[PDB]
Structure formats: structure tokens, C-alpha cells
Design a protein around this ligand. Structure first.
Ligand SMILES: O=C(O)/C=C/c1ccccc1
Ligand SMILES: O=C(O)/C=C/c1ccccc1
Ligand code: NA
Ligand code: NA
Ligand code: NA
Ligand code: NA
Lengths: 377, 377
């Protein structure tokens, strides 16, 4: 017998995704260990290496699901609350990597996201974070919403807190990548607001993603204005990937509600749909609940009028080699938006600059603090 | 330009070490991100792949040192205490992977361990852990010692706490792997005691490692008996790798001082020195401050008399494919020590079973709690 190991061929093929799978070293957000990746991939079938192929992501979903199941079994037999929660967190992370690039069975994908959300909701009662979970009603839409307070938060010991609203992108899960990002703000005694807009979080595959996500963000801003615990004059909006595109829309439409806005590798338009790499065509199709033939028209509608002014301070982090949001379009926006837009461009980074996420989230979190301080915090 | 990535050849070669480098997802202990591994290895020279070769580990030390330096630069310009500490933690992790398998410049290795310890000591004042740091005098030896209390610990709100003493192995660093393990006990409202015996932690390359480490453990037990905050009737000793060998010695010599002992992949004797794989010959030589020709005689001295009774409950986690502490010798000890020794053996795992460390540390931490409960906690 040889020790369980990942094939070199498979590690190479997955290089783009490894920084995403490991993501940020977090306190609360679910995260894989190296051995979870070995459990998922050590017996992955050989000769299955096409990231654009349906067959690759089916086997990926099956193998990551097995690892999630193993952690649920640990959770169910756990002898302590602390062990139970650590196992639920590990399960949630594994089920997310099972589902995030799997689009072929809508019911299975929704089921995996329900497993993740059940892991999160089960874990809240044991958390040392205060989580205020509710639905925000936006016309007929009941929007899952989480307002999370820093460790050791007591309303009577605090002035009203600054708050960062963070948006999902196309294929993130709220309590995985977005809670991971949110910890950089919770760590600075800021409240955070994370949410499942249409086509986001547990709504992915249920409702189409809303291009006008700023409508839903406006409803969060109204809740935060009404909450005595939150200083609504000290708000930030952060989005990642397609959520960064939402950040640019928020900057244009309701920017005056925000001290500052962070765009983690969104852009004002998407590369040609037909030529998108990996599984991105099926990812966009799934989120918009549309077929291949309808998607370029949606991309045409998504494209921003960059002549429309941005109404607050924007910080964009972008990779020169981004193959979804091309750097040329981001640099054009940076030039046109002038002194109100700061661009951190990494020369040899792909989409979301994930080799640099620890360093750039340090810089981003301190930049947000600085903008609150500039607004009299 | 292509995105910064690790060579497939290099990822393959390093497969044994990747689970060790990523280790445990921690709250306090320094830990790398995937992008730190990319920063270290993306420009690693081609055709340098011999894990037994001095030239491999020189380039490894140089490249990881660059990543550590980059995080010190972030720490030094950090705009907040929280950002400063996260950067110091990242630097410490990187400097540890720079040094842990580098033996060719004693002064450089000691310097890197001093950087790590400076990162740790600098971080303590900002920690929400109470760290009581002192020297324990053992004859002429001044032993660095850290007694760490759980998050939110107040003596007046608590009965005297159980305490887990955790030992380094040959090439671990106290505040990296051992603090990572310790968090599983801190998370259960137990105190932990971590320490630099002779040839351990900042003493590696200064004093030879003590075979009779139980002498130093006895001095910790005396301090814990004297500390009103600690229930000295509720003590555990845990060791990892060569520290697990120390755990077996503690079980034999002072086991009656412990409710239970955990052996993470130590054994009662080491495989033949001359045939050790990778850089293990130079690792053992460095820790014992001896040349190649003296080391088999030291291995002969290390070998336990397994007929000497173990005086408490022992839990061993071991890999069938361990190439340092052979499973046959561990199974012989398990049989001879009978009902007082429990063995968790993973069929396809190498030394320390690092593909399983999250799951087995859940099980181990609950087993320790159970042993304290059996002793009336
Ligand atoms: O939600 C998306 O569409 C993408 C999010 C994301 C999050 C982390 C890394 C890369 C992409
Ligand atoms: O200190 C040693 O000799 C080895 C320790 C260790 C720690 C973590 C993983 C593998 C080995
Ligand atoms: Na358990
Ligand atoms: Na308010
Ligand atoms: Na900073
Ligand atoms: Na005591």
C-alpha cells in the first residue's frame, strides 16, 4: 500500500481552484483541511481532467459529498458541543466544494446548499458571535439576512457600530466565502450584514440572480438605519467576483448611503459568454436560470454605463490575468472614475487574486477603517 | 504571463509535507495560506526534487524566508493592531517552514526560530488568551514555559482547571504545531502547558535534546501542583512524533501523575538510522548535536523496555505506513500494555496520519475529557 495522496495530474488541473478551496484561515467560517482534499481526490478517477466537462464535476460532487457525509457522521456521534460544531463546519465546507461548480442536477445542488445552511443555523446557538437572522421582505421576495456582531459584543458597552454589507458572487455560499471575508471586519469591532439575494446563497437554483441587486441592498440599508445598534452613517458595501459587479452598481445608484465600497475582482462588463473558460457558461446559465442561447443578451444588459458617476470612495482589487472581468475594462473605469476609485492591480494574478487574499484583505480591512475614520468615527 | 502556480513535479515531491505545512485550521497558532505556498514555491528552481538533498532544503529555506520577510514588512506598516498580529502570525508560519528541515547553517536556523518566538511574544499582549510565560529551572537548565488559559478565563468564575502538557517532537516549533494541537483542549475550557525542553523550540541547536524528557515534565507537574488555578489531579500529557516517544516514557516513569497520556505517532523504538528517508538523518543529528557515526548508538539507548509497566491510560494514534516508528513495534507495545493502551491505527497513513489530523484530534480531545470525567471532573 502507498499513502493516500492526490495525483500530480489532478493537482495541476485544479491549480486555479486550490486557492479558492482553501480560501481564508477563519475562526467561524467553515474551512477544509489538506486531508479533506486528499479524502475527496485520492481515489478520483484517472483520465478525467477537463474543467469544462460535466463528467469532471459530477465525479467532483460525488467525491466531496462522501467527505461531507463522513463529517456529518462525526458530528452525529460527537461527545461534546465543541466537537459537534467543528464537524458541522468541516461538513459544510466539503458540501460547498461538492456543489459550487456542479449544475447538472438542480435538486441535488439545492440539497447540498440546504445541508450547508442547516450546518450554519445549527452552529449559531453555540457561537460566541451574536447572529440576528431574519427575512427582509422586498415586494414579494423573502430575503434571508444575517446581522452579525463582533465577539463579546454588548449593546450597553458600545456606541452604534459601523457595518459592512457583503455580497455573494455567482457561486459563493454566504456562510463559507462571505463569512470568511466578513471576519476581517468583525475582527475590527464592526458589525457585518450577509444575505441571500435572488439567485444567491440558498436561493441559487430557486430564483434567478437579480442584475439590480442594489434594490435588495437598499432594503438592508433601511433595516440598518432602523437598528439602534448600527451607525448607518458608517456603512461599507463589499462584493466579491460577480458581487463586485454589484458593488460597482451600488456605487453608481446608492453610493451616497456608503462611506466606501470594496470591489474584489468585479468589473463593469463580462468577457464574451461563448468563449468563457472552465464551467463558467453553465455557472452563469444556472444562476440566471437561462439556457446558453439567452446568456450573451443578459451579458449585454449587465454591461455598466461607466459614464454614470460613482457616488462614494471605491477600492478595487483586480488581477491582470482575470479571464472573466478583463483588466482593460477595469482600468478604463479606474481612469473615468478618477480620485473616487483606487485600483490595486496584481501583475500575475488570475480572477480574485487568490494567491494574495490574506495580504489584500489586511489592506482592504484597514482601508475601510480609514474611510470610517475620515467620516468622523 | 501565466498566473503564479506551483510546479506539478514539486507538488508531487512535497506530498508527504503538504499536510504538515497546512497542519490544523487554528484560531491563534500561526498558519500558512495556499498563496503563501505559491509565493514560496512558484519560482522554486526546476530539477531540484531530492528531499534527502541539502541543496533542496537550502532553496526551500531561501524561498520561505522571502515570504516571511514580506509578512514582516506588512506587519511593520500595518495600520491596526489586528492587522499587525495577523501579519506576525503569517510571518511566523513561513519562517517555521523555512527552518524546520534546514540543518546546514546552525546560526541561520536559530535566527529563524528567534524570529518565530519574537512574533509569538509580540502577539501575546494583543491575545484574548491569558499566557503566563516564565522559565522553570531544572538544575542549571532554564526551561521556557507557557501556561495558557481558555478564552474569557477568570480565576474567580472557575474551579481549578484540568491541564494538558504538550511536547514538541524533533522539528516542531512550540507556538506552531504544538499550540495548534493545544487549541483542541483550550476549546474545552482546559488550561494547556507548552514548553521548550533541551533541544526543543528555541533550544534546538543550543542544547542536545534530552532522551529523559520526563525529568523536565516532572518540573512542570510540580509548578501545576503549586498553581491554585490548576487541578493537578486532572493532568494529561500529549506528545507528537518524537514527543510521542516522550509520552511513552512519561507513561512508564511518572504515569501516576496523569489521568491519561496521548501518543500521536511516537513509538518505543526508531527505524534503523542509516536507512531513514528524506532529511531524517540530518534532523536527528541536528537535534542531538551529534554526527552520523554516533546516531545509531543513541537510537539503541532510546529503545524502550516495553516490559516496564505503563502507569496510566494511553491513547496512541499511528499510521500503518509510518517509516520512522514502525507499526509492528507499536502493535507489540499495544498488546503487552493490554487494557491500559488504546491504539487507533489508520491503514494507509504515513507518520502522524496527517490526512486524518482534524478527525483524530476531535476524537482525542473528547477521549481526554472522558478520562478527566472518569477521574471525577
Ligand atoms: O460568487 C462567485 O461568483 C464567486 C465568488 C468567489 C469567491 C471566492 C473566490 C473566488 C470567487
Ligand atoms: O517534532 C517533530 O519531530 C515532529 C512533529 C510533527 C508535528 C506535526 C506533524 C508531523 C510531525
Ligand atoms: Na468525539
Ligand atoms: Na441605525
Ligand atoms: Na494595513
Ligand atoms: Na494546582
Amino acid at each position: 500500500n502507498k499513502p493516500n495522496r492526490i495525483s500530480p495530474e489532478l493537482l495541476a488541473t485544479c491549480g486555479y481552484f486550490m486557492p479558492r478551496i482553501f480560501f481564508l484561515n477563519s475562526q467561524y467560517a467553515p474551512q477544509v483541511h489538506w486531508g479533506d482534499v486528499v479524502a475527496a481526490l485520492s481515489h478520483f478517477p484517472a483520465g478525467n481532467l477537463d474543467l469544462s466537462s460535466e463528467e469532471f464535476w459530477y465525479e467532483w460532487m460525488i467525491n466531496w459529498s462522501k467527505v461531507g457525509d463522513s463529517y456529518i457522521n462525526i458530528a452525529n456521534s460527537a461527545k461534546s458541543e465543541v466537537s459537534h460544531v467543528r464537524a458541522l463546519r468541516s461538513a459544510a465546507a466539503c458540501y460547498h466544494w461538492a456543489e459550487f461548480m456542479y449544475f447538472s442536477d438542480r435538486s441535488r445542488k439545492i440539497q447540498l446548499r440546504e445541508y450547508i445552511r442547516s450546518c450554519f443555523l445549527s452552529s449559531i446557538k453555540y457561537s460566541d458571535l451574536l447572529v440576528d437572522h431574519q427575512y427582509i421582505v422586498v415586494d414579494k421576495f423573502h430575503m434571508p439576512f444575517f446581522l452579525i456582531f463582533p465577539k463579546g459584543y454588548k449593546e450597553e458597552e458600545n456606541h452604534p457600530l459601523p457595518c459592512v454589507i457583503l455580497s455573494n458572487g455567482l457561486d459563493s455560499m454566504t456562510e463559507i466565502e462571505i463569512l470568511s471575508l466578513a471576519e476581517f471586519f468583525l475582527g475590527k469591532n464592526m458589525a457585518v450584514a450577509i444575505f441571500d439575494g435572488p439567485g444567491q446563497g440558498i436561493n441559487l437554483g430557486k430564483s434567478p440572480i437579480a442584475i439590480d441587486m442594489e434594490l435588495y441592498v437598499s432594503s438592508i440599508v433601511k433595516l440598518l438605519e432602523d437598528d439602534a445598534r448600527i451607525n448607518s452613517n458608517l456603512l461599507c458595501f463589499l462584493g466579491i467576483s460577480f458581487g463586485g459587479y454589484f458593488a460597482l452598481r451600488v456605487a453608481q445608484r446608492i453610493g451616497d448611503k456608503f462611506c466606501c465600497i470594496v470591489n474584489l475582482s468585479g468589473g463593469p462588463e463580462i468577457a464574451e459568454f461563448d468563449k468563457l473558460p472552465r464551467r463558467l457558461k453553465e455557472d452563469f446559465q444556472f444562476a440566471f436560470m437561462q439556457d446558453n442561447s439567452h446568456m450573451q443578451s443578459i451579458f449585454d444588459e449587465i454591461k455598466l454605463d461607466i459614464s454614470l458617476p460613482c457616488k462614494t470612495k471605491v477600492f478595487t482589487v483586480h488581477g491582470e490575468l482575470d479571464d472573466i472581468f478583463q483588466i482593460d475594462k477595469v482600468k478604463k473605469l479606474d481612469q473615468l472614475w478618477g480620485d473616487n476609485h483606487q485600483l490595486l492591480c496584481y501583475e500575475s494574478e488570475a480572477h480574485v487574486c487568490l494567491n494574495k487574499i490574506n495580504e489584500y484583505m489586511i489592506q482592504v480591512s484597514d482601508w475601510v477603517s480609514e474611510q470610517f475614520w475620515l467620516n468622523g468615527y
